[PDB]
Write a protein that binds this DNA or RNA. Structure first.
Ligand code: MG
Ligand code: MG
Ligand code: MG
Ligand code: MG
Ligand code: MG
Ligand code: MG
Ligand code: MG
Ligand code: MG
Ligand code: MG
Ligand code: MG
Ligand code: MG
Ligand code: MG
Ligand code: MG
Ligand code: MG
Ligand code: MG
Ligand code: MG
Ligand code: MG
Ligand code: MG
Ligand code: MG
Ligand code: MG
Ligand code: MG
Ligand code: MG
Ligand code: MG
Ligand code: MG
Ligand code: MG
Ligand code: MG
Ligand code: MG
Ligand code: MG
Ligand code: MG
Ligand code: MG
Ligand code: ZN
Lengths: 53, 122, 44, 111
RNA sequence: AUGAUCAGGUAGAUAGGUUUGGAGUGGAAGUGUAGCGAUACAUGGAGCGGACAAAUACUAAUCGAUCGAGGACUUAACC
RNA sequence: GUAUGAGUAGCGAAAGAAGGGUGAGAAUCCCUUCCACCGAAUAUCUAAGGUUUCCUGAGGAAGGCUCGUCCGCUCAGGGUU
RNA sequence: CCGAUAGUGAACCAGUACCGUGAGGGAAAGGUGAAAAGCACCCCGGAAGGGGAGUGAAACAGUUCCUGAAACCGUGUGCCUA
RNA sequence: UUAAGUUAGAAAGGGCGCACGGUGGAUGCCUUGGCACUAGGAGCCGAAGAAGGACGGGACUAACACCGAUAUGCUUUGGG
């Protein structure tokens, strides 16, 4: 329950190959022209589905 | 149904509170699952108000919290959440069958990244 | 758990005080050696 | 003349937690990179956002470049001076805690 | 467990609601009658009814974005 | 002085919810309503001990097992008849 | 004879801070520049911190500030790798 | 077209070489402080209150140094 040998740099980086984070799922608001998340209310013009919220 | 991180008595008290603020304010901001659960309760309550009996009124009063919405110059007596539910909210949806509420997603909270929404009855 | 140090002002000054040191040949020895080393507080 | 840069020296966030967000905006147009940083829910995003906007501003003012034709040329995170703290464990011993800092650098150039 | 798998995204019954049901519990509230009263009887297999069934676009699956081929050489048979 | 274990163990008994306000920034600060917990105590005094931790106006580097616009933290003036 | 792990424990507010009821034990910590001439003014930011401008022989001398090795952490790429 | 055969290429990530940074404080140079001695001097202070301290004194004063309610100092004799 305690490491027998220290971990080399190659093995550490190989383990960290999957420890990234993905890219946000966004597109452009039709009214704004600005970026926003899909299926969300855009924070700039405060509209969703062509109607003001 | 879903357990919301709290036991049966605490969960029931959370649902009675949230279903009352939606009646009084008509628009509140909460989290995702916490909104997807009160969606059902508020609509069952509005159906009870739609019936409009005395049996229905008592059955709804067994769930509404007893708090004042606003005081009116009727002698100036206040009105309560049950009165508003049976006199204002329920007559609005006389010609509507279901779906008295909608949920609009907003985005994560700074403190803990919780996905917040807005639930509002129209 | 009752711990080992239970403070008291009187019980401190009556055992470790200056007059208690100065009342004995060996207490005066202690004061002399602390003056020799150069300490800021003697006895106390 | 063609590139501008801005650094944030000794920010309190730890380097390993900021590199994971830096690795997202590398080699991307600034208009898209700002939105990338705005919609990702991490604590390092506001710091990198401020650094990137500072770099864009002093590209536009000092060297008179076109905003719409800028890309994130290079972005990296360096170690800073760490602060040494302690945490009292059980049975009378203490354990070390490192409050690490970082330096964040971003460079914008035309493409 | 999370990925994954499967059923769907207005070319819609995918989830919630609404309307009918069903299991389950067992005779609701209000009013009336009998009794001094606890209580009993009627209206009435009544009322309630998470997760089960069928209908129904009322609410949410809007709008968009990303990835993804033009196919090496040699020989062998009609060619 | 700096690594590996590793973004891993832990974050120290407990019920919170929404609406307004402040602010560059709010689950965490202020106000309101509802809910909940102790109640031979988790209430009120008072010795020992501590020694300014008390109050007001500013502050957000470090301390606070998260955040902080807040604090028994930082700065400056007061306060014990 | 030493030259900042050396030489007194102490080249710096050292028998100090801290530890112990007490007697007692007992550290770490030097260097901008010849001269503060210690960055007016503009820009991003709440600030910190930066990019210009200026002083200076030097700012890659900007308040652990002469020199600045190794461990350690990164960015880019020439050859190889399921 | 089909059949049989042969060989390229690839990088989610990694290895080696090089270039450029960050952290860290070694090495070089320097001296404010020490160590060991030589020649000379001096080898005691106190009831006329000692050695050592506490509290105070500045326009602003937390600390060092100086001073003592005559308190960041008073009188006099010389130097400048
Ligand atoms: Mg209970
Ligand atoms: Mg599909
Ligand atoms: Mg349905
Ligand atoms: Mg149909
Ligand atoms: Mg039945
Ligand atoms: Mg493990
Ligand atoms: Mg855990
Ligand atoms: Mg806790
Ligand atoms: Mg709140
Ligand atoms: Mg109780
Ligand atoms: Mg009891
Ligand atoms: Mg006292
Ligand atoms: Mg204490
Ligand atoms: Mg204090
Ligand atoms: Mg206070
Ligand atoms: Mg803070
Ligand atoms: Mg904090
Ligand atoms: Mg304080
Ligand atoms: Mg040196
Ligand atoms: Mg030394
Ligand atoms: Mg002590
Ligand atoms: Mg110098
Ligand atoms: Mg500045
Ligand atoms: Mg250099
Ligand atoms: Mg020099
Ligand atoms: Mg090096
Ligand atoms: Mg590589
Ligand atoms: Mg002699
Ligand atoms: Mg003698
Ligand atoms: Mg004179
Ligand atoms: Zn918009």
């Amino acid at each position: 329950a305690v490491p027998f040998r220290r971990t080399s740099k190659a093995k550490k980086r190989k383990r960290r190959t999957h420890v990234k984070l993905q890219l946000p799922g966004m597109n452009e608001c039709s009214n704004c022209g600005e970026y926003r998340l899909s299926h969300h209310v855009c924070p700039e013009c405060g509209q969703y589905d062509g109607k003001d919220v | 149904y879903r357990k919301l991180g709290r036991t049966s008595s605490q969960r029931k008290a959370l649902l009675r509170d949230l279903a009352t603020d939606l009646i009084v304010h008509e628009r509140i901001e909460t989290t995702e699952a916490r909104a997807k659960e009160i969606r059902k309760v508020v609509e069952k309550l509005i159906t009870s108000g739609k019936k409009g009996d005395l049996h229905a009124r008592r059955q709804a009063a067994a769930f509404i919290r007893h708090e004042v919405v606003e005081v009116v110059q009727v002698k100036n007596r206040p009105v309560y959440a049950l009165q508003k539910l049976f006199d204002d909210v329920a007559p609005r949806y006389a010609e509507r069958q279901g779906g008295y509420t909608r949920i609009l997603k907003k985005g994560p909270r700074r403190g803990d990244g919780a996905p917040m929404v807005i639930i509002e009855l129209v | 758990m009752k711990r080992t140090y239970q403070p008291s002002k009187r019980k401190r000054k009556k055992v470790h005080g200056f007059r208690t040191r100065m009342s004995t040949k060996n207490g005066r020895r202690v004061l002399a050696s602390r003056r020799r080393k150069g300490r800021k507080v003697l006895s106390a | 003349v063609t590139s501008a840069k801005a650094v944030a020296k000794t920010v309190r966030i730890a380097p390993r937690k900021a590199r994971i967000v830096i690795d997202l905006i590398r080699g991307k147009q600034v208009g898209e990179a700002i939105a990338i940083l705005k919609y990702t829910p991490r604590s390092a995003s506001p710091i990198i956002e401020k650094v990137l906007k500072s770099a864009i501003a002093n590209a536009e003012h000092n060297y008179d470049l076109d905003i719409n034709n800028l890309v994130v040329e290079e972005a990296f995170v360096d170690e800073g001076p760490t602060l040494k703290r302690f945490r009292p464990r059980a049975q009378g011993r203490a354990s070390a805690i490192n409050k690490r800092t970082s330096h964040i650098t971003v460079v914008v150039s035309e493409v």
